[PDB]
Amino acid sequence: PDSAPGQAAVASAYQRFEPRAYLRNNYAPPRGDLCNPNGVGPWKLRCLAQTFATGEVSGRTLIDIGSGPTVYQLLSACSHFEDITMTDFLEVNRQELGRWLQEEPGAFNWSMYSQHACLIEGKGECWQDKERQLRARVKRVLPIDVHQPQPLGAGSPAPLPADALVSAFCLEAVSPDLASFQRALDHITTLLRPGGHLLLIGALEESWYLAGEARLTVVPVSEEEVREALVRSGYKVRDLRTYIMPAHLQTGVDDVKGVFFAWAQKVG
Amino acid sequence: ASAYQRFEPRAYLRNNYAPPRGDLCNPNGVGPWKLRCLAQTFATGEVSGRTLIDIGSGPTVYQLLSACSHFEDITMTDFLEVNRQELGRWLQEEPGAFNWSMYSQHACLIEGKGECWQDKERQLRARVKRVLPIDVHQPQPLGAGSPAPLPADALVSAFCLEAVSPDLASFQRALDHITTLLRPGGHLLLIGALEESWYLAGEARLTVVPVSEEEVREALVRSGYKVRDLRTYIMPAHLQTGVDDVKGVFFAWAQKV
Numbered sequence: 001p002d003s004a005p006g007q008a009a010v011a012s013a014y015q016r017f018e019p020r021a022y023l024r025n026n027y028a029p030p031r032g033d034l035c036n037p038n039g040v041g042p043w044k045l046r047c048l049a050q051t052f053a054t055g056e057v058s059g060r061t062l063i064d065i066g067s068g069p070t071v072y073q074l075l076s077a078c079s080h081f082e083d084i085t086m087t088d089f090l091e092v093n094r095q096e097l098g099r100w101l102q103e104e105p106g107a108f109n110w111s112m113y114s115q116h117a118c119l120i121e122g123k124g125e126c127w128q129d130k131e132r133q134l135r136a137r138v139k140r141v142l143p144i145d146v147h148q149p150q151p152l153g154a155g156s157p158a159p160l161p162a163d164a165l166v167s168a169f170c171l172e173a174v175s176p177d178l179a180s181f182q183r184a185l186d187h188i189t190t191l192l193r194p195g196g197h198l199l200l201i202g203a204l205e206e207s208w209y210l211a212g213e214a215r216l217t218v219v220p221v222s223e224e225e226v227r228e229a230l231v232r233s234g235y236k237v238r239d240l241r242t243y244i245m246p247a248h249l250q251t252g253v254d255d256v257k258g259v260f261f262a263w264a265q266k267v268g
Numbered sequence: 269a270s271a272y273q274r275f276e277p278r279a280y281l282r283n284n285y286a287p288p289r290g291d292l293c294n295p296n297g298v299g300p301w302k303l304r305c306l307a308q309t310f311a312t313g314e315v316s317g318r319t320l321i322d323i324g325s326g327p328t329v330y331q332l333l334s335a336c337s338h339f340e341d342i343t344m345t346d347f348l349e350v351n352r353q354e355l356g357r358w359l360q361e362e363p364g365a366f367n368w369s370m371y372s373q374h375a376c377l378i379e380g381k382g383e384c385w386q387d388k389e390r391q392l393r394a395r396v397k398r399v400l401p402i403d404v405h406q407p408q409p410l411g412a413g414s415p416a417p418l419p420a421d422a423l424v425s426a427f428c429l430e431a432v433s434p435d436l437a438s439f440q441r442a443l444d445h446i447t448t449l450l451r452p453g454g455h456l457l458l459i460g461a462l463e464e465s466w467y468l469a470g471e472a473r474l475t476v477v478p479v480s481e482e483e484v485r486e487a488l489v490r491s492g493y494k495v496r497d498l499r500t501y502i503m504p505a506h507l508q509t510g511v512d513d514v515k516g517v518f519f520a521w522a523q524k525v
């Protein structure tokens with residue numbers, strides 16, 4: 001009935017979130033081994049690329065929701081949108097992205113990811129061009145709280161409404177339970193134009209994951225629960241696919257059983 | 269021969285395989301053209317077999333990137349000790365090895381089989397069995413009883429012959445010599461400079477025989493080849509860099525009759 005406590009537990013916990021430990025855990029090998037095609041890294045990139053390759057998802061503006069310190073989620077996207085907004089709750093994540101944007105050395109190195117995207121998009125693009133294009137198309141990096149009814153604040157910088165939304169491993173990772181999840185989904189939906197698209201990626205049946213000192217709580221959701229929430233928010237589900245986590249990628253960083261990918265189109 | 273004694277491998281790599289000639293991002297550059305020729309040729313599935321030899325490899329490996337998934341036993345060669353050492357460093361992942369990874373990535377891009385560049389390099393490294401001395405001026409260019417499995421099912425050679433040959437006839441004999449290493453029905457992929465006469469490798473100033481496409485064709489024919497394919501890349505102004513006077517590059521696919 002009342003959300004404050006749960007939300008406050010969530011904000012408290014993320015106060016200990018360590019971005020480098022998160023990157024190492026989920027984006028360095030073995031999870032970051034893009035050489036095995038049966039691995040989660042290549043499956044993620046594939047979903048994005050295949051989705052954008054339909055040409056059916058385009059426009060001027062895009063908002064990435066809960067970017068964290070990662071950019072892979074925008075590699076295939078950046079060729080289809082002039083204007084990209086990145087976002088995160090945590091300043092320390094916003095700074096991490098700042099470092100990649102300034103092309104500093106001390107930044108996380110996404111080049112294997114960039115190269116792989118270029119590889120599977122099959123336009124023969126070099127990875128440096130791809131990266132240079134993402135850095136150009138990222139127009140701002142903003143604070144976000146998906147629990148607020150206006151997740152970006154009032155009269156925010158972001159072009160509203162966006163033609164498309166991307167969100168990866170955010171909603172379920174910051175929502176104490178399924179009702180919270182649903183509301184978060186409902187809040188971000190106010191940012192998308194009617195007829196626009198949402199690409200949603202996340203963890204299935206996950207209850208915790210590590211990010212350094214911080215052990216964080218996740219609402220474990222199923223595919224059927226994700227579909228239902230999407231429908232319940234005013235979306236037509238165009239695609240919902242599931243990746244089952246192989247034992248060898250279950251590393252003790254979380255209890256994730258699998259990953260879901262959703263392409264949904266806002267009805268209107 | 270004495271001219272090749274002053275030959276600095278890093279200065280050659282830097283002059284030809286680093287920017288601008290080594291920027292693989294523009295598809296109109298000489299780098300991408302070369303890899304495209306190699307890749308396209310192997311993708312035909314007609315250049316196949318068990319053993320292959322690369323003639324005058326110098327300190328470079330790119331010429332085998334697409335090849336290496338078609339031949340389980342690979343032999344690399346060069347006249348100079350220093351080049352053989354520079355190859356060693358990259359094969360053995362040693363310190364101060366040249367970084368070929370942009371080229372690996374591009375072969376993977378071009379071949380379009382969704383391969384990661386690390387697997388490509390791994391396979392190449394595994395399939396190169398030996399790096400041997402060679403002198404194409406010799407009738408048996410490899411010497412008497414070489415470690416190399418002869419005759420080979422195929423041959424590669426890039427920028428070697430025209431660059432070790434004073435004139436057309438010295439060039440034609442060199443071709444005749446290496447052609448003896450190639451099993452009849454075998455395949456030659458030959459790449460070289462068009463109408464070039466000199467190029468620099470650090471302190472070394474090397475002499476080259478200026479050859480034309482028609483000259484290259486006639487030579488392969490006279491050596492006993494059926495020219496399956498012969499293409500030319502004209503050298504753009506922006507890639508004419510003071511390190512030589514190459515006018516174009518040629519790629520030849522030939523098959524010993």
Ligand SMILES: Nc1ncnc2c1ncn2[C@@H]1O[C@H](CSCC[C@H](N)C(=O)O)[C@@H](O)[C@H]1O
Binds near residue numbers: 017073093145
């Ligand atoms: N109340 C809130 N509203 C929106 N984002 C939040 C939030 N609380 C935490 N986050 C962000 O949720 C992210 C989960 S990590 C996901 C990182 C990136 N999307 C990738 O795909 O891996 C963290 O960056 C965290 O800071």
Ligand SMILES: Nc1ncnc2c1ncn2[C@@H]1O[C@H](CSCC[C@H](N)C(=O)O)[C@@H](O)[C@H]1O
Binds near residue numbers: 275328402428
């Ligand atoms: N008499 C000879 N017989 C065989 N190779 C020779 C030779 N004299 C010089 N070479 C080698 O010919 C090479 C020319 S340059 C290296 C070409 C390399 N394959 C690439 O594609 O760039 C040098 O490595 C040089 O040392």
Ligand SMILES: Clc1ccc2[nH]cnc2c1
Binds near residue numbers: 209
């Ligand atoms: Cl397997 C996997 C991949 C990425 C993730 N981000 C958060 N949890 C994850 C789990």
Ligand SMILES: Clc1ccc2[nH]cnc2c1
Binds near residue numbers: 284298427512514517
């Ligand atoms: Cl443009 C170019 C590329 C490779 C070469 N090797 C010898 N001369 C060259 C010239």
